[PDB]
């Protein structure tokens, strides 16, 4: 559940 | 890179491939076809490579090691493949050899070096502690990393990667019996974890995400009992006092509040019902487009509100005309006004939307139809702004997602799960067709590449495997085809979906798949030829 | 759900 140093902004909706 | 070199029966061949090709090439094994994974991750290879890694790790002199980076990456790639690939299973003598190799790197005098090169290999060692199921084995090292961390370590990208791995260990440890049995007695770990989360130097800094992860894992420790319990509670109380739910340090406050609320009693910390207070603080702007759309937002300009309302208003009219609704909703649906909830960024969405709406945020937003028949049900689209979203509103996924509200209220009976037949092709196809109309180059392109789907296949589309080409582009093509060539049929289908007659809906589109396949192909041909 | 780690993010 912990976040990585980089996460994607431009994702598809859930 | 040559992924085939990793498939030799000789462990020395595989070792040599790791060493010569390096970590960037070992990366391929995580995703490789099963045949390659089965051959690269034979138990004998894992054991022999771990034994080589032990000797190399003992000899390590600091300053990074390309070879050790690749070797530990390979070992934990094996555990990755073992988890997901039913044809990869390790014999019981593998993991002790892997633990020996981790021990060798941990016991090396250079283990706590601060440098990017060391961080590159250290990162893969720390993650191997989780991948190999060794979460119970290195808690004194987790504790040392938490207490040693400072602003100097935080300068280095790969040191941040590496130490952030200890939160992966804590999270994965929930499935490790020895970990669950001992973690509640780890008073020094709890103190170091709490104090790591309380480091004010992390706020606004490159390691803030680590402090937030620490607050979340500290709150998770309330699920365990033991001699550390009072320290966990004390440190959480300090987090909730030092920071706040909206403001300085709120990533740490909310991370901890998330797990405390789930695993413990919110009243022991004074945070009960924080989610509703948080909503009014973060989504502080209210802009009513119309009786059918209201925006709650964190930080939008007037121009953005105006643009969002007029874009949705245009789509709303196009939808009602195209779907011939008469603006009459399906029965048992009182979702009269869509609430459009827009955070300032994906980062803000990932921080605030979870508690406010009780959702996962590892995504690009979502529409929550809820139960449309229940009094007080609120239809909520939850979204964020983004620099590369569509002008002039700059709300990511707004035009597509907005159609899901309309389709849900005017076309599809019941809540999201009501259908007893597959309807993904329609739901996503109509969201694309209404929002994009005839401007969809990706849909033309997927015809041109010569790989296609029949109507029969499109109607069977599901979210499993998330084939986005099939779901979004071919869903759009089938929908657009039916509207252009067989609108009377679409209206016939909608009689059934609007009442929840899902078997009738299936029988209706079953006829389309039998009758119309060659015409669908002709229509695709015309679409491509128009483009040329 | 538990899931083993894939790749770590490289520095841009
Ligand atoms: Ca519905
Ligand atoms: Zn959609």
Residue numbers in the entry:
A (entry chain B): 1 to 14
B (entry chain A): 78 to 609
C (entry chain C): 1 to 12
Copy out sentences from the published article reporting this entry, exactly as the authors wrote them.
Protease VhaC is a multi-domain enzyme composed of a CM containing an activator domain and a peptidase domain, a PKD-like domain and a PPC domain. Sequence analysis using Conserved Domain Search showed that VhaC is a multi-domain protein containing an activator domain (Ser70-Tyr346), a peptidase domain (Gly347-Val605), a PKD-like domain (Ser606-Ala698), and a PPC domain (Leu699-Gln814). VhaC had activity toward various types of collagens, showing that it is a collagenase. Structural and biochemical analyses and molecular dynamics studies reveal that triple-helical collagen is initially recognized by the activator domain, followed by subsequent cleavage by the peptidase domain along with the closing movement of CM.
However, only the crystal structure of CM was solved to 1.8 Å resolution. The CM crystal belongs to the P 21 space group with one molecule per asymmetric unit. The CM structure contains residues from Cys78 to His609, suggesting that the N-terminal signal peptide and propeptide in the CM precursor are cleaved off during enzyme maturation. In this study, the crystal structure of the CM was solved, it having a more contracted saddle-shaped architecture and lacking the catalytic helper subdomain, when compared to that of Clostridium collagenase ColG, the only CM structure in the M9 family. Unexpectedly, the structure data show that the CM molecule binds two peptides (peptide P1: 24-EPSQQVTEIYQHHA-37; peptide P2: 48-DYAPTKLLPQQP-59) derived from the propeptide of VhaC via hydrogen bonds and hydrophobic interactions. While peptide P2 entirely binds to the activator domain, the N-terminus of peptide P1 binds to the activator domain and its C-terminus extends and binds to the catalytic center of the peptidase domain. Correspondingly, in the CM structure of VhaC, the C-terminal residues of peptide P1 also bind to the conserved Gly441-Gly442 motif, representing the S1′ peptide recognition site. Therefore, peptides P1 and P2 can be regarded as substrate analogues in the CM structure, which may provide clues for the recognition pattern of collagen substrates in CM. In the CM structure, a catalytic Zn2+ is tetrahedrally coordinated by the side chains of His477, His481, and Glu505 from the peptidase domain, as well as the side chain of a histidine from peptide P1 instead of the characteristic water molecule observed in 2Y5022. In addition, a Ca2+ ion, located on the left rim of the active-site cleft and 14.2 Å away from the catalytic Zn2+ ion, is coordinated by the backbone oxygens of Gly485, Leu489, and Gly491 and the side chain of Glu446.
